[PDB]
Each structure stands twice: as C-alpha cells, then as structure tokens.
Symmetry: D2
Subunit: 86 residues, 4 copies
C-alpha cells in the first residue's frame, strides 16, 4: 500500500498551475514510492497538501506556498525518512 | 455526482509530462464539475484514463495519446453529453 | 555550432498556453543539450505555429490541428539532427 | 523600452529544473498574456537559475536565495513593465 498524496487548491484563485507543477515535482522525485497524487479543485482560498490524510502543508498555517526542496523534504520525512535527497 | 478521473502513466517511459498536461487541460475545462484528477505512476507502457473507473482512453485500444479536444469531449460525453463546451 | 532557437506561437484567447508550455517541456526534456532555447509567444486569432530558427515545422491549419509528442520530436530531430 | 518585454529563464538542465522553469513561464504568461512579447526557456549548465526581462536580471538563485514564489516573480516583472 503506497502513500497517497492530495493537493486541494482554490480554482478561482488560479492556483491550478502551481498545484499541477507541485504534483509533477512530487512524481518526478517519488515516482516508485507513491501510489498517486490527486489534484482536487477546491474553493475559498484553500491550499492544502496531505500525505494519507496528514497535512504536510496548509497555506494559512504554513504562511504561503512551498518551494520544491521543502515540499520534497516534508514528503520524504513521512514516507522514507532515511532517504538522503542531496 | 462529480466524477473521479485517473490517469495511469508509465513512469519510465517519460510520460509524466503529458499526463500532468492532460490533468491540467481537464481541470482547466471542468474546474468545478470534477471531483479530482489523480496521476498514478505505472509501469510497462501503460497509459490509461478512466472516469469513475470507466476507461475513456487506453494507449493500445485507442492508438496512441489523446488530443485535448477529444479528451475533453470524451469526458463531457460520459458526464453529460448535452453539456455544450463552446470551444 | 550556434544552437537552434525554437519558437511556439499560440493563441492566447483559445487557452492554448497549457498545450504550448507542455510542448516546450517535451522538447527541452528530449533535446535539452542540442537546442538554444524554446520561446513561448502569446499570439492572435487561432494561431498555433512552431518554428526552428524561422523554419516552420508545425502550423495548425496546414498540419490539421496539434502535434502528438512523437511527431513533434521527429520533425525537430529531422531538422536539427 | 517600447517593445513588449522579452522574458528569459535560464535554468540548469542537469539539475532537473526544467519543471520549475516551465511552471514559472506558464505563471507569467497566464497573468500577463499578450502584455509579454515572449518567455524563453534557456537550457543552461552549472547550477544557474536566472530570470531576465529585456536582459535585466530580476532573479538569480545565489543572490536571491533560491527560487521565486509566484507572487514575487510577477511583481518584479510588474515593477519594470
């Protein structure tokens, strides 16, 4: 059972591009280790990324949007903490 | 009920880019109307797109990869064939 | 020794930015080494045209739509390699 | 400057920065559309990540401390234009 990642993003805030980019950054790094990445259109300024239900990022709490390094690290810390990302 | 869309794509075939693009084309067109689009890393030359489990594209069956028009129309046809897409 | 410059002109209104950006990435993934740049150029009514140093390798009307990634990479390969 | 801005994103190809460069290109073009002349994606070497407008640097990896978020990227472009 490989982990499942969800990205909930506000459609009218035009956050689809950044959500899709982040999905592709995740899949490029963790291709063989994750089951899927789900892009979930949402409303009202929501931007949230979960790994099997655990929030690794949420816009209000985390103060914006993640850079690729910090996103990969937070996913790694949950699914494969021993992996060196460089 | 808002459908779940899944795109299964072969990781080692370098098909992430096209899978991600199609996900974006789908979400851009059907924003509200779609529950989610899942990108599902797969192996062995698989490229398959399903709408709530119903196959709307598969590489071997359909002879390659879909253009954005045919992709959008196939999804529309499955969710409400009477819905106009302008376009 | 100067590297080819590829341009993708696309209709802004037709929402063709997504497919243009995707093609730019398919091109740079495959020919990273051999090309100098890929330029995305927002353009007017119904245009979708790809050029390699001015040479047209795809136009929407004349080629009957939009290219699949194999026939895009092959047409570039033929011109640059 | 009286021509439409030419934007260029030079990115390290061996670092797998194509994804993030193509993404920023799309963010820029989605926001500014035909107010931009072009966004050029330029395969580079050696950890380079540089964004210019008509040749003026508005972002560089080592002096700006990494990679821009969409909000700041767009504003720096807006500032010049």
């Amino acid at each position: 059972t490989k982990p499942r990642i969800a990205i909930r993003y506000c459609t009218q805030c035009n956050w689809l591009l950044r959500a899709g980019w982040m999905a592709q950054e995740i899949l490029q790094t963790f291709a063989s280790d994750i089951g899927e990445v789900s892009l979930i259109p949402s409303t009202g300024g929501l931007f949230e990324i979960t790994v099997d239900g655990t929030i690794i990022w949420e816009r209000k709490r985390d103060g914006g949007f993640p850079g690729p390094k910090e996103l990969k690290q937070r996913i790694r810390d949950l699914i494969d903490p021993e992996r060196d990302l460089g």
